[PDB]
Amino acid sequence: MTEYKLVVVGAGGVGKSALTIQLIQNHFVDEYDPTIEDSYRKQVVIDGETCLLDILDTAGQEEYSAMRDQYMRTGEGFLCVFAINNTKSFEDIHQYREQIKRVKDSDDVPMVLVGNKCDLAARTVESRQAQDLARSYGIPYIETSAKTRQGVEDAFYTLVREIRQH
Ligand SMILES: Nc1nc2c(ncn2[C@@H]2O[C@H](COP(=O)(O)OP(=O)(O)NP(=O)(O)O)[C@@H](O)[C@H]2O)c(=O)[nH]1
Ligand SMILES: [Ca+2]
Ligand SMILES: [Ca+2]
Ligand SMILES: [Mg+2]
Ligand SMILES: [Mg+2]
Protein backbone atom coordinates (compact mmCIF):
# COMPACT_ATOMS: atom_id res chain seq x y z
CA MET A 1 0.00 0.00 0.00
CA THR A 2 0.97 3.66 -0.28
CA GLU A 3 3.25 4.97 2.46
CA TYR A 4 3.51 8.64 3.40
CA LYS A 5 6.65 9.73 5.24
CA LEU A 6 5.71 12.66 7.47
CA VAL A 7 8.12 14.64 9.64
CA VAL A 8 7.00 16.92 12.47
CA VAL A 9 9.39 19.85 13.13
CA GLY A 10 9.42 23.03 15.21
CA ALA A 11 10.89 24.65 18.33
CA GLY A 12 11.11 22.92 21.69
CA GLY A 13 7.88 22.63 23.64
CA VAL A 14 5.44 23.62 20.88
CA GLY A 15 3.60 20.29 21.10
CA LYS A 16 5.07 18.15 18.31
CA SER A 17 4.95 14.99 20.43
CA ALA A 18 1.56 15.75 21.93
CA LEU A 19 0.13 16.26 18.43
CA THR A 20 1.59 13.03 17.09
CA ILE A 21 0.52 10.99 20.13
CA GLN A 22 -2.99 12.45 19.98
CA LEU A 23 -3.25 11.43 16.30
CA ILE A 24 -1.83 7.93 16.70
CA GLN A 25 -2.86 6.96 20.26
CA ASN A 26 -5.88 9.17 21.01
CA HIS A 27 -4.75 10.65 24.32
CA PHE A 28 -3.17 13.91 25.50
CA VAL A 29 0.33 13.87 26.99
CA ASP A 30 0.27 16.51 29.78
CA GLU A 31 3.90 16.20 30.86
CA TYR A 32 6.89 17.61 29.01
CA ASP A 33 9.59 15.06 28.13
CA PRO A 34 11.88 16.54 25.47
CA THR A 35 12.27 14.31 22.42
CA ILE A 36 15.45 13.12 20.76
CA GLU A 37 13.79 11.38 17.82
CA ASP A 38 10.80 9.00 17.77
CA SER A 39 8.95 7.10 15.04
CA TYR A 40 5.27 6.12 14.76
CA ARG A 41 3.56 4.01 12.10
CA LYS A 42 -0.15 3.46 11.56
CA GLN A 43 -2.41 2.24 8.78
CA VAL A 44 -5.32 4.58 8.12
CA VAL A 45 -7.83 5.36 5.39
CA ILE A 46 -7.55 8.86 3.96
CA ASP A 47 -10.00 9.91 1.25
CA GLY A 48 -10.81 6.30 0.47
CA GLU A 49 -7.17 5.29 0.18
CA THR A 50 -5.78 2.73 2.59
CA CYS A 51 -2.27 3.89 3.42
CA LEU A 52 0.55 3.78 5.94
CA LEU A 53 1.58 6.90 7.82
CA ASP A 54 5.20 6.84 8.90
CA ILE A 55 5.70 9.79 11.23
CA LEU A 56 8.97 11.11 12.59
CA ASP A 57 8.67 13.17 15.78
CA THR A 58 11.82 15.30 15.94
CA ALA A 59 13.73 17.29 18.58
CA GLY A 60 12.94 20.97 19.12
CA GLN A 61 15.89 21.48 21.48
CA GLU A 62 18.64 23.27 19.56
CA GLU A 63 21.18 20.89 21.10
CA TYR A 64 20.08 18.32 18.51
CA SER A 65 20.02 20.54 15.41
CA ALA A 66 22.72 18.40 13.77
CA MET A 67 20.11 15.65 13.31
CA ARG A 68 17.97 17.77 10.98
CA ASP A 69 19.86 17.15 7.74
CA GLN A 70 19.21 13.40 7.95
CA TYR A 71 15.48 13.56 8.66
CA MET A 72 14.91 16.32 6.11
CA ARG A 73 16.55 14.14 3.45
CA THR A 74 14.18 11.22 4.09
CA GLY A 75 10.86 12.98 4.74
CA GLU A 76 8.21 13.44 2.04
CA GLY A 77 6.20 16.12 3.84
CA PHE A 78 6.75 18.37 6.84
CA LEU A 79 4.41 19.57 9.56
CA CYS A 80 5.94 22.86 10.68
CA VAL A 81 4.63 23.49 14.17
CA PHE A 82 4.72 26.59 16.36
CA ALA A 83 2.64 27.46 19.42
CA ILE A 84 0.20 30.37 19.27
CA ASN A 85 1.36 31.51 22.74
CA ASN A 86 5.05 31.49 21.77
CA THR A 87 6.09 34.26 19.39
CA LYS A 88 9.69 33.05 19.28
CA SER A 89 8.51 29.59 18.05
CA PHE A 90 6.67 31.30 15.19
CA GLU A 91 9.79 33.29 14.28
CA ASP A 92 11.75 29.99 14.43
CA ILE A 93 9.67 28.49 11.58
CA HIS A 94 11.70 30.26 8.92
CA GLN A 95 14.93 28.48 9.90
CA TYR A 96 13.13 25.13 9.59
CA ARG A 97 11.67 26.07 6.20
CA GLU A 98 14.99 27.42 4.94
CA GLN A 99 16.82 24.20 5.80
CA ILE A 100 14.08 22.03 4.33
CA LYS A 101 14.38 24.14 1.15
CA ARG A 102 18.17 23.73 1.03
CA VAL A 103 18.15 20.00 1.75
CA LYS A 104 15.32 19.29 -0.72
CA ASP A 105 16.79 21.78 -3.18
CA SER A 106 13.21 22.84 -3.86
CA ASP A 107 10.87 25.77 -3.31
CA ASP A 108 7.94 23.33 -3.59
CA VAL A 109 8.28 20.88 -0.69
CA PRO A 110 5.01 19.52 0.72
CA MET A 111 4.43 21.30 4.03
CA VAL A 112 1.68 22.53 6.34
CA LEU A 113 2.05 25.36 8.86
CA VAL A 114 0.49 24.42 12.21
CA GLY A 115 -0.36 26.79 15.06
CA ASN A 116 -0.73 24.58 18.11
CA LYS A 117 -2.13 25.15 21.62
CA CYS A 118 -5.18 26.97 20.24
CA ASP A 119 -7.03 26.02 23.45
CA LEU A 120 -4.86 28.54 25.34
CA ALA A 121 -5.87 32.19 25.62
CA ALA A 122 -2.40 33.76 25.96
CA ARG A 123 -2.27 34.22 22.20
CA THR A 124 0.58 36.31 20.79
CA VAL A 125 0.44 35.01 17.21
CA GLU A 126 -2.75 36.15 15.50
CA SER A 127 -4.32 33.91 12.88
CA ARG A 128 -3.75 36.41 10.07
CA GLN A 129 -0.04 36.70 10.85
CA ALA A 130 0.33 32.94 10.37
CA GLN A 131 -1.93 32.88 7.31
CA ASP A 132 0.43 35.42 5.73
CA LEU A 133 3.54 33.36 6.50
CA ALA A 134 1.92 30.22 5.07
CA ARG A 135 0.84 32.16 1.97
CA SER A 136 4.45 33.24 1.34
CA TYR A 137 5.49 29.57 1.39
CA GLY A 138 2.55 28.49 -0.78
CA ILE A 139 1.12 26.21 1.93
CA PRO A 140 -1.99 25.97 4.17
CA TYR A 141 -2.19 27.19 7.78
CA ILE A 142 -4.16 25.18 10.32
CA GLU A 143 -4.68 25.67 14.06
CA THR A 144 -4.67 22.71 16.42
CA SER A 145 -4.96 21.73 20.02
CA ALA A 146 -3.33 18.46 21.04
CA LYS A 147 -5.26 18.85 24.29
CA THR A 148 -8.80 19.08 22.88
CA ARG A 149 -8.07 17.28 19.57
CA GLN A 150 -9.21 20.32 17.59
CA GLY A 151 -7.68 20.24 14.11
CA VAL A 152 -5.29 17.36 14.84
CA GLU A 153 -6.48 14.84 12.25
CA ASP A 154 -7.05 17.76 9.88
CA ALA A 155 -3.42 18.90 10.10
CA PHE A 156 -1.92 15.49 9.36
CA TYR A 157 -4.46 14.58 6.68
CA THR A 158 -3.94 17.98 5.03
CA LEU A 159 -0.22 17.21 4.85
CA VAL A 160 -1.00 13.91 3.08
CA ARG A 161 -3.20 15.85 0.65
CA GLU A 162 -0.27 18.24 0.03
CA ILE A 163 2.12 15.36 -0.69
CA ARG A 164 -0.42 14.05 -3.23
CA GLN A 165 -0.30 17.39 -5.08
CA HIS A 166 3.42 17.04 -5.74
N1 LIG B 1 -2.69 23.43 26.57
C2 LIG B 1 -1.95 22.74 25.69
N3 LIG B 1 -0.78 22.24 26.08
C4 LIG B 1 -0.15 21.57 25.08
C5 LIG B 1 -0.59 21.37 23.79
N6 LIG B 1 0.34 20.64 23.06
C7 LIG B 1 1.31 20.40 23.91
N8 LIG B 1 1.07 20.93 25.16
C9 LIG B 1 1.93 20.84 26.34
O10 LIG B 1 3.16 21.46 26.03
C11 LIG B 1 4.26 20.72 26.63
C12 LIG B 1 5.24 20.33 25.54
O13 LIG B 1 4.63 19.39 24.64
P14 LIG B 1 5.51 18.41 23.76
O15 LIG B 1 4.57 17.69 22.87
O16 LIG B 1 6.39 17.64 24.67
O17 LIG B 1 6.42 19.39 22.93
P18 LIG B 1 7.51 19.10 21.85
O19 LIG B 1 7.32 20.09 20.75
O20 LIG B 1 7.34 17.70 21.44
N21 LIG B 1 8.95 19.29 22.58
P22 LIG B 1 10.42 18.77 22.16
O23 LIG B 1 10.82 19.56 20.93
O24 LIG B 1 11.38 19.13 23.28
O25 LIG B 1 10.34 17.29 21.93
C26 LIG B 1 3.61 19.55 27.37
O27 LIG B 1 3.45 19.88 28.74
C28 LIG B 1 2.26 19.39 26.68
O29 LIG B 1 1.26 18.84 27.51
C30 LIG B 1 -1.83 21.92 23.39
O31 LIG B 1 -2.36 21.84 22.27
N32 LIG B 1 -2.46 22.61 24.42
CA1 LIG C 1 -2.67 12.60 29.86
CA1 LIG D 1 6.97 26.37 -1.05
MG1 LIG E 1 8.71 16.12 21.61
MG1 LIG F 1 1.66 41.10 18.00
Going by the annotation, the residues of the binding site for GTP are 13-18, 29-35, 59-60, 116-119, 145-147
- The whole domain housing 137 covers 1-166
Bridge partners of 123, per DSSP, are none
Q: Tell me the residue type at 91.
A: E
**C-alpha–C-alpha distance, residues 165 and 160, integer Å:** 9
Q: Quote the number of domains for the chain.
A: 1
State how far the alpha carbon of 161 is from the alpha carbons of 4, 9, 37, 50, 76, in Å. Answer: 10, 18, 25, 14, 12
What is the torsion angle, in degrees rounded to the nearest 10, for the CA atoms of residue 142, residue 143, residue 146 and residue 152?
Answer: -30
Q: DSSP per residue over the chain, as a string?
A: -EEEEEEEE-STTSSHHHHHHHHHHS----S----SEEEEEEEEEETTEEEEEEEEEE--SGGGGGGHHHHHHH-SEEEEEEETT-HHHHHHHHHHHHHHHHHHT-S---EEEEEE-TT-S---S-HHHHHHHHHHHT--EEE--TTT-TTHHHHHHHHHHHHTT-
Tell whether ligand 1 has an atom less than 6 A from the beta carbon of residue 59: yes
Residue 166, domain CATH: 3.40.50.300
Bridge partners of 115, per DSSP, are 82, 143
Phi, psi of 40 (to 5 degrees): -130, 145
Resolution of the experimental model, in Å, one decimal:
1.3
Protein residue whose Cα sits closest to atom 16 of ligand 1: 32
Phi, psi of 141 (to 5 degrees): -115, 135
CB 110 within 8 A of CB 165: yes
**C-alpha–C-alpha distance, residues 143 and 123, integer Å:** 12
**C-alpha–C-alpha distance, residues 35 and 2, integer Å:** 28
Residue 95 CB partners (closer than 8 Å, separation 6+): none
Q: How far is CA 6 from the centre of its chain?
A: 8
Bridge partners of 42, per DSSP, are 53
**C-alpha–C-alpha distance, residues 95 and 25, integer Å:** 30
**C-alpha–C-alpha distance, residues 47 and 165, integer Å:** 14
Q: Which residues surround ligand 3, an ion (CB under 5 A)?
A: 137-138
Closest CA to 140 of 95, 110, 102: 110
**C-alpha–C-alpha distance, residues 9 and 38, integer Å:** 12
- Per the entry, the structure determination technique was X-ray
